[PDB]
Every structure is written in C-alpha cells, then in structure tokens.
Subunit: 96 residues, 2 copies
Amino acid sequence: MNLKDMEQNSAKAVVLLKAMANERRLQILCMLHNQELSVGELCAKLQLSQSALSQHLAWLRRDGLVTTRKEAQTVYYTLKSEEVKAMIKLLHSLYC
Amino acid sequence: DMEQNSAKAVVLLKAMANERRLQILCMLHNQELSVGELCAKLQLSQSALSQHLAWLRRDGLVTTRKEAQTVYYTLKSEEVKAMIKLLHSLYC
C-alpha cells in the first residue's frame, strides 16, 4: 500500500541527499546555481586546487548532478538534474 | 561565507541521508509524535526505530519531551523543515 510509495521515494531522495552531502561538492553545486563556470573561475572562487577540483567535478559528473559545455579548450560546468537545482535554490535562500 | 554555510548544510544533509531517518523527519514535519505513533504510521516497531531516533537526537535535529512515561518527538530545524517540504513536492 502507501508504505511502499513512501519507501521508494524516500530512497530516491536519499540518493540525491548522499550525492550532495559533502563540503566541496556542495560548494561547487552552490556556485553553479543559475550559471556556468570554467575550471579557472571555480578554483579561484573556491580556492581549491586544480586537482582537488578535478576529482570533485568528475564525481559530480558521475552522479549526473553537473554537465559540461566546451569552448576552445575552455569547458563550462553547470547544474544538470532538476532536483539538485531546486535543493540548491532552496539552500541559497536559507543561507543568504 | 561559503565554507561556513556549506559545512552547516552538509551536517543537515548527512542527518537526512538515510531512508529510515528521512521517513521519521517526514512524519515529524508539522506534528509532534510519540514513538508509538511513529511506529504506527511507519509500521515499524519501537526497537526498529530506536537506532534512528537516537541518531536524530544526537544531531539536535529532533528534541524529545517526556510526559507521563511517554516520550514525544519534535523536528527542531527550520532549515530541515524547509528541505522536507521541498523533498515532498519533488517526490510527491
């Protein structure tokens, strides 16, 4: 009955939650709120090493929370899933 | 700024990132409940919930109020309350 509906969705929610529950990833996700940024803009605005950033980004990709858009050797990252976009939008209104 | 807030959000996110703990929080949103009532609504025994309720307590996300041998639970966080409402709309 209604037990399983709540069960299956709580599971989907926990999926997004776990993907977001990490300091560096959240900072990155928050920075991509309604905008595209290149590696350079991200490492400077977060004071994160190129390699540290490279790892978190790769991870974010994998979980499909961020996408890319190339350009003469300059790639731009942006949010992907509608769920993270909304949670990020809310997190922004909560701490701003 | 960024690091200070991302840290606070992450702590809330971590407390919510567990199926059972989330269901509990989902039940406690806008309606103080006893353990028995949570058990009834989630169809889980008290012992089955104990580990999750204890976790939610140590993180201050829920506060307990005793009354004539019965313990009542209340969702503390306004940020969590906001996130639960959004989660509800996103998956319901």
